[PDB]
Structure formats: C-alpha cells, structure tokens
Write a protein that binds this ligand. Structure first.
Ligand code: W3D
Ligand code: W3D
Ligand code: W3D
Ligand code: W3D
Ligand code: W3D
Lengths: 262, 302
C-alpha cells in the first residue's frame, strides 16, 4: 500500500533515472589524480564500511558518502594524506542527510585517530558542499534495489540481503564500477542474487519497469559475477565480515554460482 | 550561486526560525523582492545543520509554481544565506486578520487545488514535507499559495524505511504517527492538508490537542475510535491501547456543517484512518470538489 507509494513509484523511478545521470562521477578521474589510486580508494571505502557498522548507520548513508567522494574526486585533486579527510566529511554530510540520529562531529574526528582536527573536518564539510553545490539527494544502488525487490514472487530475505551485499561490494572497486550507473549495478546485483538463491532470472516485469534486459545488463553482470567469485581473495574484507551477521541473513556465507548461463 | 550580499538591501525582519532570522530584501540590480533566511554556520560546533542541508538539497530540485522557489545560496565561511522568492503573507495570518467572516468557497477551493499540486509534485520527487500547517503556506497578491518551510522535509526511498517520529506540528499530525507506527508515508502530508482544508472552512483548527494522547482522543471523538474493520492492523500498533475509549464516528455534516456534499467527500477521503485508503494528492486533484475552479495556473519562477 502507501508505504510502497503506488501512486508515485513510477514518477520516482523515472526521476531517479534522470538524477543518477546528473549525479554521475567522471568514469576516468582516477588517472587524472596524480597521487591517489583505485587501491587507496578501496581502502577508504572499506574503512567507511567499518565506520557505518561501528556507529550502526544505514547502508544508504554509506552509498551516499561514496557518491559524494567520487563526485568530489572528479573535480578536486587530493593528496593521499588528505583522502581520509574528504571521506570523513563525506560520511558526516551523508549522515546529516540520511540519519535520524547522526553521530556528532566529535565522533567523526575520533574515528580518524586524531589525524585531523574538528576545524579541518568542518572546513572540509564546507568545501564538499561547495564542490557538490549542495546537490546531496543522489540516487544510490539501494534506492533502485528496494524498488526492484517489490517484483519478487514472493519476497525472499536472502535474495534481498545478497543483492544488498553485491551492491556494496561494487562501491569498493572504482574499476570497473565507476562506469556503471547505480540502477544498472542494482539490476545486476538483483539478478545475480535471485539466480544464486532461487535459480530464477531478472523478471519480465522489471524489463517493463526499467527497459533493461539480460542483454543490456550482461557487461556489468559479468563484472559482478567475478567480483562475487573473488570476494574471499580481495584485500578488503569489511563488507564480507558485515554480511556474516544474522542481521543480513549471513548471506556472505552463501556460495557464488560457478556459471550464469547468459 | 551567482549572488553577493552587496547586491541586496534589507527592508525589514519578517520572521525568525529556531535556526536564524528572515528579512525581506530587495535586489538592487534587478529590483526583485526576496526573503533572505540567515543560517549562522557558527553559533554551532556541528557545522552546517542537517535542517539546512536537507532544505537546500531538496528545494534546489523542487521547481513548481506552488513550491516557494529557492533562488540562491550565498555561502560565506561565517554565514549562510538562503535567498527565497518573496510572498507577502501566510495562510494563518490571512485567516486571523481578513478571513474573520470567512474565506469564500471559490478561494478555499483554489487554495486547496494549488496545495495539492505542490504536494503531488513533492511526492513525485520522493520528498515528504512533514510540517504542513497554515503558517508554512505563503500566499502572494496574485492569489497563488505555496508550500514553504522545508526544514523538516526528507527524501524517501520506496518502500519507505523508519524515519524520525518527532514529525509534524501536533494539531496536524497523522494518527499513524501518534500511534507510534514503524513506517509512515505520503499519507501523513495528505492528513495535514485534510486538517488545513477543514481549518480554512471554519477558521479554527480541527484537532487542537494539548498532548499526544489528547490529540488522538480528539481525532477519535470526531472520526470514531478506529478498529480492525476500519483500519486493519490498528490494534497491533505500538502505542495503541486496548483501554482506548470507543467513541462513535460522527457524520461529517456535523464536523464541518457549512461544507457541501463534494467537500465532505474529499475531506473524509483525506482524513481516512487507514493510510493505505487515504486519498493521494494526485488522485485528489480529480475530485469533483474542484470541478468549477478556474483560477489560471500560477506561473513558475526563474
Ligand atoms: O594508518 C595507516 O596505515 C594509514 N591509513 C590511515 C587511514 C586510512 Br582510512 C587508510 C590508511 O592507509
Ligand atoms: O596517509 C597517507 O599518506 C596514506 N593513506 C592514508 C589514508 C588513506 Br584513506 C589512504 C592512504 O594511502
Ligand atoms: O551580514 C550582515 O551584516 C548581517 N545582515 C545581512 C543582510 C541583511 Br538583509 C541583514 C543583516 O543584518
Ligand atoms: O519559509 C521558508 O523556508 C523561508 N521563507 C521563505 C519565504 C518567505 Br516570504 C518567508 C520565509 O521564512
Ligand atoms: O441534520 C442533518 O441533516 C445533519 N446535520 C446534523 C447536525 C449539523 Br450541525 C449539521 C447537519 O447537517
């Protein structure tokens, strides 16, 4: 009923589709960053995954913060010693946007282990707002996931959690995921999840909603399947740790499929 | 944005929020009368308040003739200035000063139709207002009326997740909030507009309670105490008590006597208990109540 906004879900979907394009980071900015690499970024995002769990934050907050970081690093060159400061401010801003009870600025300072001052966090907060022009209501993978979930026949919590998990894995790896829109990664994540858990594929009803097919999703889906298969080997493990928890139905313990037949 | 404070001349104070002061100002170069909301980034060890971060991010996106336009944001290191379209009055002050013998029915209908347009647009862009009340509805001289004060608003996901419960000024607060429900949705804004519609007819609040429990009781005494029949799930809700007195539903003819059949219909649909059955802003626009509204659509601002 109303909690799934029957009278507005299409309007909203269409609008998020338009906005994910405006809020999209530059695919190739990492090469233009002299002093930071995909690997450093992965380390930061993995750390932000741990900060989200330490402060019991929403997964949405996590996705928003990544979005802010990637858009910031698209126009501003950052020395490696300052990347954490950008991330911290991004997380602060996202928390203030998304959370009922954001952690105080002091806690954001505390999790940096006194690398930075409260003044530096607040000044960077200002800088990020400037750079993004207060454009903070960004479509996330999650905003699409939760809508696609309404197309399960019937609802399966392992499917949902696994889709969330895969989605979060994609935040870690700028190559290749910077080249895919939130809506597409979510599509891929949902299909992989559904296939893994129930053997089923991306539903026709979602083909109607999204205009996406297994055809269009294929590139992303091949990348996501690889990310899933190699996840236990990745340098960054904080997301798999998180998804062992019963909260998320311990979905990181499920075995990836060996082939997709696609 | 492209603005500097040097280009505005302050005219008078027009309001003060719990987060700063509003002045009426004039753009010295274009002539435009604006409202300037000052948000002191200092007087705060937490930096830019969340209320401001949501207001700007959300309003930047919401360009509609019945939503107050955010024109600019001037971002000093010390202060933050929101530049808004200026409207001379609010709906509360109009009813208390000029609508003493009443707001005539054409004007009520025009205002409600505009409020619904604005609200439908919010909902269509995944924004809940969460503080619709007459004080937060600005009217201009051309007879436009516009949702304002987005400092309690929020961008929602689909389906919604649990959001802040301390939401909505009490008199306008939906039963599902009062009963502590885990989830609430677009239907809370529609309720508030319901309350407002009634208020415009009578010039007095429909449910002026002095506590959460008094508020619920006043609602129940007017609309009847809800049960599983009228609202499936109600009796399982966190703050629903078995002990609640069971009042009978009263004919809407006795709730707002001056209101005609179409009005009473629309009103009952706005004040339906079950948020799932409560009318949407989108649906409400096609209600027969609005058949003879002919005030030309206000134009959107640049
Ligand atoms: O302390 C370190 O080893 C440096 N450092 C600090 C913080 C983060 Br996040 C990443 C990182 O490499
Ligand atoms: O402090 C540094 O230069 C090293 N460093 C610190 C923090 C992060 Br995040 C990445 C990184 O390479
Ligand atoms: O910035 C200031 O000097 C304060 N100020 C700015 C602008 C206006 Br209008 C009034 C006012 O007191
Ligand atoms: O209502 C707001 O959010 C700010 N604002 C905008 C316009 C006018 Br007139 C008054 C005022 O307080
Ligand atoms: O008498 C009626 O038709 C119903 N009724 C009752 C009471 C009031 Br006040 C108005 C009204 O219409």
């Amino acid at each position: 009923g109303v909690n799934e906004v029957p009278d507005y879900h299409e309007d909203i979907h269409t609008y998020l589709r338009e906005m994910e394009v405006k809020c999209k980071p530059k695919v190739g900015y990492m090469k233009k960053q002299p002093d930071i690499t995909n690997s450093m970024r992965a380390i930061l995002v993995d750390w932000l995954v741990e900060v989200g769990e330490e402060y019991k934050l929403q997964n949405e907050t996590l996705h928003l913060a990544v979005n802010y970081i990637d858009r910031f690093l698209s126009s501003m060159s950052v020395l490696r010693g300052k990347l954490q400061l950008v991330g911290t401010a991004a997380m602060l801003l996202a928390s203030k946007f998304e959370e009922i009870y954001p952690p105080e600025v002091a806690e954001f300072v505390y999790i940096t282990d006194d690398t930075y001052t409260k003044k530096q966090v607040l000044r960077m907060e200002h800088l990020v707002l400037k750079v993004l022009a207060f454009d903070l209501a960004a479509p996330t993978i999650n905003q699409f996931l939760t809508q696609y979930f309404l197309h399960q026949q019937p609802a399966n919590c392992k499917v949902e959690s696994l889709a969330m998990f895969l989605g979060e894995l994609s935040l870690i790896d700028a190559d290749p995921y910077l080249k895919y829109l939130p809506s597409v990664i979510a599509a891929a994540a949902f299909h992989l999840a559904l296939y893994t858990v129930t053997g089923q594929s991306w539903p026709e009803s979602l083909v109607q909603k999204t205009g996406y097919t297994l055809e269009t999703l294929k590139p992303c889906l091949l990348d996501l399947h690889q990310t899933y298969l190699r996840a236990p080997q990745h340098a960054q493990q904080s997301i798999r740790e998180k998804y062992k928890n019963s909260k998320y139905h311990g979905v990181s313990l499920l075995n990836p499929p060996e082939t997709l037949n696609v | 944005g492209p603005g500097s404070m040097e280009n505005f001349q302050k005219v008078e104070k027009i309001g003060e929020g719990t987060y700063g002061v509003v002045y009426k100002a004039r753009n010295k170069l274009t002539g435009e009368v604006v409202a300037l909301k000052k948000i002191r980034l200092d007087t705060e060890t937490e930096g830019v308040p969340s209320t401001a971060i949501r207001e700007i991010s959300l309003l930047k996106e919401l360009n509609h003739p019945n939503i107050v336009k955010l024109l600019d944001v001037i971002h000093t290191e010390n202060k933050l200035y929101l530049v808004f379209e200026f409207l001379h009055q609010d709906l509360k002050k109009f009813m208390d000063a000029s609508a003493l013998t009443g707001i005539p029915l054409p004007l009520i209908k025009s205002y409600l139709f505009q409020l619904l347009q604005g609200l439908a647009f919010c909902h269509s862009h995944r924004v809940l207002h969460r503080d619709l009340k007459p004080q937060n509805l600005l009217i201009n001289t051309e007879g436009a009326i516009k949702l304002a004060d987005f400092g309690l608003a929020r961008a929602f996901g689909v389906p919604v997740r649990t959001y802040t419960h301390e939401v909505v000024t009490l008199w306008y607060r939906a039963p599902e909030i009062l009963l502590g429900c885990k989830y609430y949705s677009t239907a809370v804004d529609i309720w508030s507009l319901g309350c407002i519609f009634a208020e415009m007819v009578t010039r007095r609040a429909l449910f002026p309670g002095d506590s959460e429990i008094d508020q619920l009781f006043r609602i129940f005494r007017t609309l009847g105490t809800p049960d599983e029949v009228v609202w499936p799930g109600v009796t399982s809700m966190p703050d629903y008590k078995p002990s609640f007195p069971k009042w009978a539903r009263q004919d809407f003819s006795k709730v707002v006597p001056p209101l005609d059949e179409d009005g009473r219909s629309l009103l009952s649909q706005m004040l339906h208990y079950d948020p799932n059955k409560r009318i949407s802003a989108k649906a409400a626009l096609a209600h027969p109540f609005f058949q003879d509204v002919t005030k030309p659509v206000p134009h959107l601002r640049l």
